[PDB]
Design a binder for this molecule. Structure first.
Ligand SMILES: Nc1ncnc2c1ncn2[C@@H]1O[C@H](COP(=O)(O)OP(=O)(O)OP(=O)(O)O)[C@@H](O)[C@H]1O
Ligand SMILES: Nc1ncnc2c1ncn2[C@@H]1O[C@H](COP(=O)(O)OP(=O)(O)OP(=O)(O)O)[C@@H](O)[C@H]1O
Ligand SMILES: [Mg+2]
Ligand SMILES: [Mg+2]
Lengths: 571, 544, 25
């Protein structure tokens, strides 16, 4: 249970200030009703109007002071709890975004979203609901213990000795609550994943008339939650029975012991009555404290996954420290081999060895599934090679600063993604300092996206939806190219960037590759299935089955009959 | 609310059982104190062992019965709340799936998921805590007002003063509380959308190195939520303080009135003193009753978004009953013009007219943004034309039954979308039953069987979320196989060969080998459009 | 005793029935 209390360490001063007010309020609630009764009796008794007015104002002052103390304590407590909730959610999201790339293949989007947004809120609600009640009733019980000691010492000692016997069952039961709550959270996360996956990609669902299948999946996910809720209700009933039985046992045992001693003359009735009168309330407080415990066990159960996220050690090297003032895009592959973490037995790449140099364009071609996108992902430091070295300007990629490296190396992606923001924000995404409107327009002109953006009613301020559905495929690809070009990278990766572009828009890419005056400042890795775009490349590498079979210029590869020649001579 | 009761109607027997158990528990609790007091009197002088045991036994019996009844009541209420929550979730999700495609452009998936996950619990949690307190307070008030008939004139004085004083402020407080709850829910949905977008596009964010930017955005959203929470809590505290002040004032007024009556000989000191305890309990019980009622009303009213979604009528024509046993496959566009509903006054298609015939291949070409995918969407009855008609076998496309229509007219999207699951589930997606041999034949027709055998589990291998664990060409081949499973009469190919290599692309050029289906080909590579019988050129939404 | 005897035995029967049903379940 110690891990739950860790999140409260930041607000210790506020919690102590709240505790002082709690003690004061408990003492007031103990003493004020007694004072009010005495004042009312004296006011009702014989006395002048001055006596009546004096007694009347005292009760009003006491009640107003009690109300003010309660208000101040409530305000402090609620402010502290809100801060705690916000801090916890922020920390959980930050911890989630630090994990390795394959972490997001094992955990799906809806599952992670449910963990981040729902588990943390439930934990915070439980903590804020239970901590104040626990403190309040612990203070009240400690206050009542003094009066119980005053009334009788030995009976208080036997009560205290008997007290630990009531906590044996919940200690042996709480693990069941923990596991049950873990299962409930898992089922809710699965249902959330199903809902998210169905709600996105609605046109695909509609075009195959599969709404009923999605509904059936959702119902199948809900059935497990229903099954767990039945057990939760039964456990609630059983625990509520047991707590009351435990309280009654104490209330009866103390009375039985008192009856015996009153008969033998070892105690006075006047002391026994005033002892039991407060033993009653002490048992009530003990019952409340007993009822708190299963909720604590449930809260421990509900926070297993998020604390696992917080304690997890990422399986990837950390960020470096190098930010060289001047960098040239010299990239060297040295016998690189790779296998995906979820299927480590199968090698996707084997013994790659090639060099990219500034001012030159290198093309990578091959059949589907050869591993070209894997090479692109390795060059962007998304994964680490299982063998060999990959050096940028003579040094390994993990030695550079995270943001500097991704400013120097930029890529487009095979099927580019855009976010639900303005076109201006999409192009300038990820930049530490905002570029001027002149640079964004220049990049859009270079990519060829300026023609259609200027035709929109709001221009560069037009909002696009979360998936870019309001744009066509070619427009989205041009926007992605403009996003890539704005950074002025020294290494440029074009992963099938002309798949959706028409004939007119391919001339922009051709001029960028082989005619722009900015060629000499960057090295280009070109991946495409459009072989006419490859003829002017400085080097051509044919990748088949994860290995490079042929290499050379277009003329050299055409003179030597082989895989590239057969691919080009398709008819 | 009226709607919530009619929704919770299937849970009537459990609510009746809970009410019965609550009544029994109250009955036991109302008599425990008498025997407790008898014990306290017996212990306090003149001890008698016989009568001591009887009082202890009666106390034990009543406590046992009340405890059992209370436990049963709590269990019943908890189960009712859970069942109501699940029913609301199911109905909301079922209603969302029927909306038109324009609805999903306006909204966001993360916000809809937030509505599913957070608003439903707020709706459902109104049963357990409120009902028990309501019934207990009502019973206490009714019982305590009867006892107080010892001084009738003061009671009329009382009911005219203490009761209607609290009505005025609660009208303002309930409105403010409802507004703040609605704002809190909106802020929570906005915060959830940030996580949705950041996690969904993780690889792009990492490729641009923008994780800290997303963290900052999420923290700003959390700060807004925290401010709203603090406002709600502060207002509740102020309301409670004002209630306590009003209760104290009312208490002082009757203390004065009762003391005035006693001096006039209306009642003795004992009657007046016993009157004040009942006064103090009754005021608090009435205040608690009104507070719980207002809280229930505000919590119910704070979730109008779910109710609005659960009853919204989609902007679609009435469902069609057509399902001919035989279909020819002739498609006709008749002066069709279209503008997207989310952005009207910006036409995309302007008076298109063409005919597609079985046994022939038609090619549709044009620049980017010309409107080819819009034509494909209109052909599949995903949108309705603003003018003109789309006909299938001389009848409107919207008059055909939904499952039959999408069984006979099938398409391949521009960027195919796959779902998490096995390969043989993505293939034959949306089919109630499909044999393994049909799946294998369709995979062979799409040239996808070669790479399927290389996977560790064959056709049962798990395709990742959105097909992320496959190459682009493999995903496109799987989409082609999914289309070819249903052997449709009308086939639409929207850039279906963009990601494929030339060797595989040239092998799939024979889309009409049987010659009994209507094929529409949308492409940019003019090599594939050379063999088409009919060629349509689309420029700025107009044929030429 | 303020409570009538018939109500006392009625509650005794209620408690006995509840215990019997709890054991039967
Ligand atoms: N996340 C992943 N986990 C496991 N295997 C994967 C994953 N992504 C891709 N693969 C596999 O790695 C191999 C290479 O895929 P890759 O995307 O690199 O091919 P490609 O050369 O880009 O293909 P294409 O021409 O279709 O674009 C394939 O067998 C593919 O199934
Ligand atoms: N959901 C949408 N809401 C609003 N406008 C849209 C939507 N989808 C597309 N458009 C717009 O409608 C026009 C037609 O786009 P469409 O997707 O039909 O083009 P396309 O001819 O298929 O082009 P491409 O060759 O790039 O695939 C464009 O101006 C586009 O921005
Ligand atoms: Mg690829
Ligand atoms: Mg298109």
């Amino acid at each position: 249970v110690r891990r739950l209390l860790g999140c409260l360490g930041s607000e210790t001063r506020r919690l102590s200030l709240f505790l002082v007010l709690v003690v004061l309020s408990s003492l007031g609630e103990m003493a004020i009703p007694f004072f009010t009764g005495r004042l009312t009796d004296w006011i009702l008794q014989d006395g002048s109007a001055d006596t009546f007015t004096r007694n009347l104002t005292l009760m009003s002052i006491l009640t107003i002071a009690s109300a003010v103390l309660e208000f101040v304590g409530d305000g402090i407590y609620n402010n502290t709890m809100g801060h705690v909730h916000s801090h916890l959610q922020g920390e959980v999201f930050g911890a989630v975004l630090r994990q390795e790339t394959e972490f997001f293949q094992q955990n799906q989007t809806g599952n992670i979203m449910s963990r981040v947004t729902e588990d943390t809120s439930t934990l915070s609600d439980s903590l804020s609901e239970n901590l104040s009640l626990f403190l309040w009733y612990l203070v009240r019980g400690l206050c009542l213990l003094g009066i119980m000691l005053w009334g009788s010492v030995s009976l208080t000692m036997v009560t205290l000795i008997t007290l630990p016997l009531l906590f044996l069952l919940p200690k042996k039961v709480g693990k069941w609550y923990q596991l049950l709550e873990v299962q409930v959270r898992e089922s809710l996360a699965k249902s959330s994943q199903v809902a998210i996956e169905a709600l996105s990609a609605m046109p695909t669902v509609r075009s195959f008339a599969n709404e009923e299948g999605e509904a059936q999946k959702f119902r199948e996910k809900l059935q497990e939650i229903k099954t767990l809720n039945q057990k939760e209700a039964v456990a609630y009933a059983v625990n509520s029975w047991t707590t009351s039985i435990s309280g009654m046992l104490l209330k009866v045992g103390i009375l039985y012991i008192g009856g015996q001693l009153v008969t033998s003359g070892a105690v006075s009735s006047g002391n026994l009555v005033t002892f039991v009168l407060y033993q009653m309330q002490f048992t009530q407080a003990v019952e409340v404290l007993l009822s708190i415990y299963p909720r604590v066990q449930k809260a421990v159960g509900s926070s297993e996954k998020i604390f696992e996220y917080l304690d997890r050690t990422p399986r990837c090297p950390p960020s470096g420290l190098l930010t060289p003032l001047h960098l040239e895009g010299l990239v060297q592959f040295q016998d690189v081999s790779f296998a995906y973490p979820n299927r480590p037995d199968v090698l996707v790449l084997q013994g790659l060895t090639f060099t990219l140099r500034p001012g030159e364009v290198t093309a990578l071609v091959g059949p589907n599934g050869s591993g070209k996108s894997t090479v692109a992902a390795l060059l962007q430091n998304l994964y680490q090679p299982t063998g060999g070295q990959l050096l940028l300007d003579g040094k390994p990629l993990p030695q550079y600063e995270h943001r500097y490296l991704h400013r120097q190396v930029a890529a487009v992606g095979q099927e580019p993604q855009v976010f639900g923001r303005s076109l201006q924000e999409n192009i300038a995404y990820g930049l530490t300092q905002k570029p001027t409107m002149e640079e964004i327009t220049a990049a859009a002109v270079k990519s060829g996206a300026h023609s259609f953006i200027s035709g929109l009613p709001q221009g560069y301020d037009t909002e696009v939806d979360e998936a870019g559905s309001q744009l066509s495929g070619g427009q989205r690809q041009a926007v992605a190219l403009a996003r890539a070009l704005i950074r002025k990278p020294c290494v440029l990766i074009l992963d099938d960037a002309t798949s959706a572009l028409d004939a007119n828009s391919q001339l922009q890419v051709e001029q960028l590759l082989y005619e722009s005056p900015e060629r000499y400042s960057r090295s280009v890795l070109l991946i495409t299935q459009h072989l006419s775009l490859v003829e002017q490349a400085d080097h051509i590498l044919f990748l088949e089955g994860g290995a490079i079979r042929e290499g050379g210029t277009h003329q050299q590869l055409m003179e030597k009959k082989g895989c590239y020649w057969a691919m080009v001579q398709a008819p | 609310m009226w709607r919530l009761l009619k929704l919770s109607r299937p849970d009537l027997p459990l609510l009746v059982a809970a009410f019965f158990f609550l009544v029994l528990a109250v009955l036991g609790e109302t008599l425990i104190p008498h025997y407790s007091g008898r014990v306290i009197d017996i212990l306090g002088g003149d001890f008698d062992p016989h009568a001591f045991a009887s009082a202890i036994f009666f106390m034990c019996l009543f406590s046992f019965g009340s405890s059992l009844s209370a436990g049963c009541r709590g269990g019943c209420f908890t189960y009712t709340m859970s069942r109501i929550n699940l029913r609301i979730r199911e109905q909301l999700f079922s209603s969302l799936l029927r909306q038109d495609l324009g609805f999903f452009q306006e909204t966001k998936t993360g916000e809809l998921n937030s509505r599913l996950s957070s608003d439903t619990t707020l709706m459902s949690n109104w049963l357990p805590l409120n009902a028990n307190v309501l019934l207990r307070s009502l019973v206490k008030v009714v019982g305590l007002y009867g006892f107080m008939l010892s001084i009738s004139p003061r009671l009329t004085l009382l009911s005219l003063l203490h009761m209607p004083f609290t009505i005025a402020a609660e009208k303002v407080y309930n409105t403010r509380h409802q507004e703040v709850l609605r704002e809190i829910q909106d802020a929570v949905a906005r915060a959830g959308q940030v996580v949705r977008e950041a996690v969904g596009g993780l690889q792009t964010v990492r490729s641009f190195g923008a994780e800290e930017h997303e963290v900052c955005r999420y923290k700003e959203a959390l700060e807004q939520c925290r401010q709203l929470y603090w406002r709600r809590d502060l207002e509740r505290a102020l309301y409670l303080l004002v209630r306590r002040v009003l209760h104290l004032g009312v208490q002082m007024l009757m203390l004065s009135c009762g003391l005035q009556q006693m001096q006039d000989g209306e009642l003795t000191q004992g009657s007046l003193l016993s009157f004040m305890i009942y006064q103090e309990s009754v005021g608090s019980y009435v205040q608690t009753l009104v507070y719980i009622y207002g809280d229930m009303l505000s919590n119910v009213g704070a979730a109008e978004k779910v109710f609005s979604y659960m009853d919204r009528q989609p902007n679609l024509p009435s469902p069609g009953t057509l399902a001919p046993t035989t279909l020819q496959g002739v498609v006709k566009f008749q002066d069709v013009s279209f503008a997207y509903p989310n952005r009207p006054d910006r036409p995309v298609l302007k008076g298109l007219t063409f005919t597609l015939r079985p046994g022939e291949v038609t090619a549709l070409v044009g620049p980017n943004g010309s409107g080819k995918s819009t034509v494909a969407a209109l052909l599949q009855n995903l949108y309705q034309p603003t003018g003109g008609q789309v006909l299938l076998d001389e009848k409107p496309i919207s008059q055909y039954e939904h499952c039959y229509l999408h069984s006979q007219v099938v398409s391949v999207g521009q960027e195919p979308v796959l779902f998490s699951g096995s390969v043989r589930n993505n293939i034959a997606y949306g089919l109630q039953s499909c044999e393994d041999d049909k799946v294998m034949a369709a995979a062979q027709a799409a040239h996808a069987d070669d790479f399927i055998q290389e996977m560790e589990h064959g056709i049962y291998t798990d395709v990742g979320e959105k097909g992320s664990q496959l190459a682009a060409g493999q995903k496109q081949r799987l989409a082609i196989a999914r289309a070819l499973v249903r052997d449709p009469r009308v086939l639409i190919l929207d850039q279906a060969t963009s990601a494929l290599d030339v060797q595989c692309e040239q092998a799939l050029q024979d889309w009409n080998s049987r010659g009994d289906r209507t094929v529409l080909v949308i492409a940019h590579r003019l090599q594939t459009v050379q063999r088409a019988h009919q060629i349509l050129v689309l420029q700025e939404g107009k044929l030429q | 005793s303020e409570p009538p005897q018939a109500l006392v035995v009625f509650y005794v029967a209620l408690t006995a029935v509840m215990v019997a049903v709890a054991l039967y379940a």
